Amino acid sequence: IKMSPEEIRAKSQSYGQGSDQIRQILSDLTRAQGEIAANWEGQAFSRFEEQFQQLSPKVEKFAQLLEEIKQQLNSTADAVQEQDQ
Amino acid sequence: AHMAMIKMSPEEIRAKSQSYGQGSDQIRQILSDLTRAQGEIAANWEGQAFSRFEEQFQQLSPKVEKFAQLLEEIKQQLNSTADAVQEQDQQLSNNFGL
Ligand SMILES: [Zn+2]
Ligand SMILES: [Zn+2]
Ligand SMILES: [Zn+2]
Ligand SMILES: [Zn+2]
Ligand SMILES: [Zn+2]
Ligand SMILES: [Zn+2]
Ligand SMILES: [Zn+2]
């Protein structure tokens, strides 16, 4: 009546894919941010830049958390299976 | 009459804007699916060890939601800016000549 190892393993994959995709978006859009900012005079873009730079470490930290949950879920599914045997 | 210059074509600005829009929607979808997942994990393990991740997820998710919102606002600004670049080009073109 709790989650099976089978299901925990599959949920883990969703966290892993979530981590990878957030990291890839952050990478691509960091490059875009730099190019836009470098080409735009005056401060029309300045607040967007400031907010992006403040939020990006938190988004990176979240992506790493998702990968840490994925790993923990795989270890837990393993553990459940070991008891079941 | 004029704006502070952006040294980028309307075509590239709109191409970048698309990527911000896509990034925003994707992050929003991920956060929603994984918030549902966190719900189910928490239902099944309550203790201190899982609590570490539960607490970090909860503290970081609103920041990630703010980041997705930010990305949509950048998409929107870039679309407005591309329009503006074209408009100023038009005006300069229009008023050209002796
Ligand atoms: Zn992994
Ligand atoms: Zn053009
Ligand atoms: Zn370029
Ligand atoms: Zn939009
Ligand atoms: Zn959208
Ligand atoms: Zn389930
Ligand atoms: Zn706490």
Q: Looking at the CA of B73, name the nearest ligand.
A: 4
Q: What sign results for the dihedral spanned by CA atoms B63, B67, B68, B70? A: positive
Q: What is the token pair recorded at B5?
A: 């210059």
Distance from C-alpha of A50 to C-alpha of A52, rounded to nearest angstrom: 6
Backbone phi, psi, residue A4, to 5° = -75, 155
- Three-class SS of B35-79: HHHHHHHHHHCCCHHHHHHHHHHHHHHHHHHHHHHHHHHHHHHHH
Q: What is the token pair recorded at A54?
A: 């403040």
CATH match of A1-85 with 1.10.287.1060: yes
Using a CB-CB cut-off of 8 Å, the residues of chain B touching A70 are none
> What are the beta bridge partners of residue B6?
A40
Backbone phi, psi, residue B2, to 5° = -155, 170
Third-level CATH fold of B1-98: Helix Hairpins (1.10.287)
CB proximity under 8 Å: A 17-76 to B: 18, 21-22, 25, 28-29, 32, 35-36, 39-45, 48, 51-52, 55-56, 58-59, 61-62, 65-66, 68-69, 72-73, 76
**Domain extent listing, chain A:** 1-85
Packing angle of the helix pair B48-94, A46-83 (nearest 10 deg)? 150
Resolution (A): 1.9
Query: Which residues make Cβ contacts (< 8 Å) with residue A56, sequence separation at least 6?
Result: A26, A30, B67
The number of helices, as runs of H, and strands, as runs of E, in chain A is 2, 0
